[PDB]
């Protein structure tokens, strides 16, 4: 279990197979015209091709914007990457805004990579040679292979390795009766240590003591990692290497954290294209959610509608609560949604409609069902009524304190008097503004 | 393999002839004949590359193909010639000045190509014998034409053992530096599988002569040169963009040494192009520095996109066309892009829907051209992908007019969004 968040109730868009919207499926009620609109871009995302697209969910504050924007992520599943970022995270003190934007852009892009490796494990029993005639003048007989006996919890098996592996063994300095790990594709050998079956009574030598090597002596299992392109970026930018004093600067916070296009193009993209065409990694193009995009400035918008035209960028979902407002960063330039007209003419717009009394009542019911509150039918109607006056946010936030008052007064369901008392103990934006205007 | 089709992925180059005569709808581009011909003239002057520091300004209405012409020039110029695309807002950094960022952007599109004739030895190792007492040994190199033997030295054996090359392996040996590079495994590289082997990727043995003299080329930009010469940390080009090279001998020395190299025939020059999209973001300081940065002999050509008209210059209150001061506007040659007509919008939509692999009906094209002439061509283009998804959802074959109409009613453009913004909407 975990904390109940403000959007823990949404699980999907609840759309029919034909593309139509259901009444209250997947926790989302009403909002058909916008849920279908965003289900269309859900299928766009599923179609990994046709990238470099942007969609702007615009509307009054808090109607359904964030709810359906993150329900897009639930419909898409955790498999595809969905990177959220509020418009206020662009301003940084150690890196530039156009670089934060590029990082988030090619951070939303995922890249899952598969690889199959064979592995060995088991307490070695003994090593012996395979003698053979001299390939050259009679200086002595040579060795062709080395037989090694590995014992595990399943059984004991003998295996043949090449003389190079025996030389690796010699320079590794293992003996008979220790735990070793071998791989055939690479050829490296790892010394795990002594086995627990030979555990000591007193000896204090700590080596992460290897327990009984449970399992077969040979095991093949596929590894499937989920790495993003920004992970590779940061790893190649500040590598955590060994004794390479260029790397020993990890003792610094290292400001000046911007990347370089030379690298970004010539080093990281080639290695990904090679893996994709070879069959080692599958590209998982993703979504970049930007709520409160109105906070971005003119420079951020200009960079946004230059990067969006890139063939590599993921699909972007902006959100807007403002109307005809001034563009931040400029002196006085009023444009719709606080977004410049040049960027607005490049993104698809979806108007999030306003809710009716019945729709807000259904939303309150769903939120009460999610928060585990046993609201009664009278308290629900009163919440609907007093939420038709104010906004939906205040109407639905009066469920935790009402339930607490109920539990304290010895109840198991929110009654009418409880919500009536909470509505008088707490106020909303308009009620508070009225008192503020009445006072000096 | 998988690099999605962006907004500008449909143009593969300017549709020009040998005499720089723009064709109507060839090579992805459509209409815009005058601006395409100007783009071709400047591209020919670029491919010539005996004049440095020339500026062009592609001005025009929003969504008329300015960035399209820029990407077309980039594609027609192809590799082996630096083309750096930058938005005007990308130079506003926190760790380096605007002038330093502009110097970086310029010097990043200037290529220096050192051509070397280092000889090597390419063949398929047959045997690698070595006896440790300094250890001494021999190697048998085979090519399809001949076989030979070599006595391996101390460091030769050291490098061979470090690289772990074995028999049947095809390798190349830089005799000057001794650098080894194994290219693959030959059919002989078969290890007679009787042990933990998991590699069987064979390849043909090298053909030709044993000890051949091939030609290598090392191409690096003046930006990379000065970056790696700045300080002992010769990895800032990948490590991080932490920079600030003083304009002392470092850059002047790069320039002087590249001049001597060009004179002595080591590496002469390959000029480049700098596409500044949305140049109106640059500051008055940026313009004032560019004024004289375009005068340097190591200055590549630049093309600046413009949507603005008579508007104040950023960082001041001076009204100037293109949002650029006349001081800099005087160096530029201005090319104006005109709006697309009905048949041009229709052809652009057709090429775009054929590039993104979406079959539209004859009436779908008509209704989409109507929507794109009443509203923005960009909105009309974005409508195609959205309309194809409803068709695929209903299990159709080609986009009809009803799907495009459903998508138009479902998604809103800027004008209809503004007209729907009838409420306060938290202004």
């Amino acid at each position: 279990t975990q904390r109940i968040a403000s959007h823990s109730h949404v699980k999907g868009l609840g759309l029919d197979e034909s593309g139509l919207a259901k009444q209250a499926a997947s926790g989302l009620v009403g909002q058909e015209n916008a849920r279908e609109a965003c289900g269309v871009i859900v299928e766009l995302i599923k179609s990994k091709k046709m990238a470099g697209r942007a969609v702007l969910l615009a509307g009054p504050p808090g109607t359904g914007k964030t709810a359906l924007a993150l329900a897009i992520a639930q419909e898409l599943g955790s498999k595809v990457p969905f990177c959220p970022m509020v418009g206020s995270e662009v301003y940084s003190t150690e890196i530039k805004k156009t670089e934060v934007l590029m990082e988030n852009f090619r951070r939303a892009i995922g890249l899952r990579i598969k690889e199959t490796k064979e592995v060995y494990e088991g307490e070695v029993t003994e090593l012996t040679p395979c003698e053979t005639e001299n390939p050259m003048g009679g200086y002595g007989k040579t060795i062709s292979h080395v037989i090694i006996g590995l014992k595990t919890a399943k059984g004991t098996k003998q295996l043949k390795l090449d003389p190079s592996i025996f030389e690796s063994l010699q320079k590794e300095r293992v003996e008979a009766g220790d735990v070793i790990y071998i791989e055939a594709n690479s050829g490296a050998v790892k010394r795990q240590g002594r086995c627990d079956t030979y555990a000591t009574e007193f000896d204090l030598e700590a080596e992460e003591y290897v327990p009984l090597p449970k399992g077969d002596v040979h095991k093949k299992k596929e590894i499937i990692q989920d790495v993003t392109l920004h992970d590779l970026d940061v790893a190649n930018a500040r590598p955590q290497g060994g004794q390479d004093i260029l790397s020993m600067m990890g003792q610094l916070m290292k400001p000046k954290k911007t990347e370089i296009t030379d690298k970004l193009r010539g080093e990281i993209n080639k290695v990904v294209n090679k893996y994709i065409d070879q069959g080692i990694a599958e590209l998982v193009p993703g979504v970049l959610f930007v709520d409160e995009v109105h906070m971005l400035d003119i420079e951020c918008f200009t960079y946004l509608h230059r990067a969006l035209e890139s063939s590599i960028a993921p699909i972007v979902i902006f959100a807007s609560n403002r109307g005809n407002c001034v563009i931040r960063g400029t002196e006085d330039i009023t444009s719709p949604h606080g977004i410049p007209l040049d960027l607005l003419d490049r993104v698809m717009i979806i108007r999030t409609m306003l809710y009716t009394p019945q729709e807000m009542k259904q939303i309150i019911k769903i939120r009460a069902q999610t928060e585990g509150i046993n609201i009664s039918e009278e308290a629900l109607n009163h919440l609907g009524e007093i939420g038709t006056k104010t906004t939906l946010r205040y109407s639905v936030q009066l469920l935790t304190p009402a339930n607490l008052l109920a539990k304290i007064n010895g109840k198991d369901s929110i009654e009418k008097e409880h919500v009536e008392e909470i509505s008088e103990l707490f106020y909303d934006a308009k009620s508070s503004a009225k008192i503020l205007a009445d006072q000096q | 393999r998988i690099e999605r089709i962006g907004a500008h992925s449909h143009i593969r180059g300017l549709g020009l002839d040998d005499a720089l005569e723009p064709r109507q709808a060839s090579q992805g581009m459509v209409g815009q004949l005058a601006a395409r011909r100007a783009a071709g003239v400047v591209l020919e002057m670029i491919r010539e590359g005996k004049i440095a520091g020339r500026a062009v300004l592609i001005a025009g209405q929003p969504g008329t193909g300015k960035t399209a012409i820029a990407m077309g020039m980039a594609q027609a110029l192809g590799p082996d010639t630096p083309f750096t695309a930058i938005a005007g807002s990308e130079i506003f950094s926190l760790e380096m000045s605007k002038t330093e960022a502009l110097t970086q952007a310029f010097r990043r599109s200037i290529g220096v190509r050192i051509k070397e004739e280092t000889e090597i030895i390419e063949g398929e190792v047959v045997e690698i014998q070595i006896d440790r007492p300094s250890k001494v040994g021999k190697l048998t190199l085979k090519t399809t034409e001949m076989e030979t033997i070599y006595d391996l030295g101390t460091k030769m054996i050291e490098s061979l053992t470090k690289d772990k090359v074995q028999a049947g392996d095809v390798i190349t040996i830089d005799k000057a530096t001794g650098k080894i590079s194994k290219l693959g495994r030959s059919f002989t590289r078969a290890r007679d599988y009787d042990a933990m082997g998991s590699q069987t990727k064979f390849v043909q043995c090298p053909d030709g002569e044993l000890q051949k003299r091939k030609e290598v080329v090392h191409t690096v930009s003046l930006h990379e040169i000065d970056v790696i010469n700045s300080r002992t940390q010769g990895f800032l080009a990948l490590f991080s963009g932490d920079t600030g090279e003083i304009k002392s001998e470092v850059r002047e020395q790069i320039n002087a040494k590249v001049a001597e190299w060009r004179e002595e025939g080591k590496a002469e020059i390959i000029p480049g192009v700098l596409f500044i999209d949305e140049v109106h973001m640059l500051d008055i300081e940026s313009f004032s520095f560019l004024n004289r940065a375009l005068e340097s002999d190591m200055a590549p050509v630049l093309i600046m996109a413009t949507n603005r008209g008579i508007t104040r210059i950023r960082g001041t209150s001076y009204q100037s066309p293109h949002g650029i001061p006349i001081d800099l506007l005087d160096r530029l040659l201005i090319v104006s892009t005109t709006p697309y007509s009905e048949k041009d919008t229709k052809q652009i939509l057709r090429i775009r829907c054929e590039e993104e692999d979406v079959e539209m009906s004859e009436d779908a094209y008509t209704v989409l051209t109507r929507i794109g002439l009443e509203t923005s061509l960009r909105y009309a283009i974005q409508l195609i992908t959205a309309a194809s998804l409803v068709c695929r959802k209903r299990k159709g074959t080609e986009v009809q007019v009803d799907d495009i109409k459903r998508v138009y009613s479902l998604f809103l453009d800027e004008s209809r969004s503004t007209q729907y913004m009838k409420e306060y909407q938290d202004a």
């Binding site: 390939p135 | 006896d131 440790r132």
Partner: peptide
Amino acid sequence: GPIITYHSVTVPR
């Protein structure tokens, strides 16, 4: 005394 010999022959492909 301790003369080692590392070899790698191309058996008859």
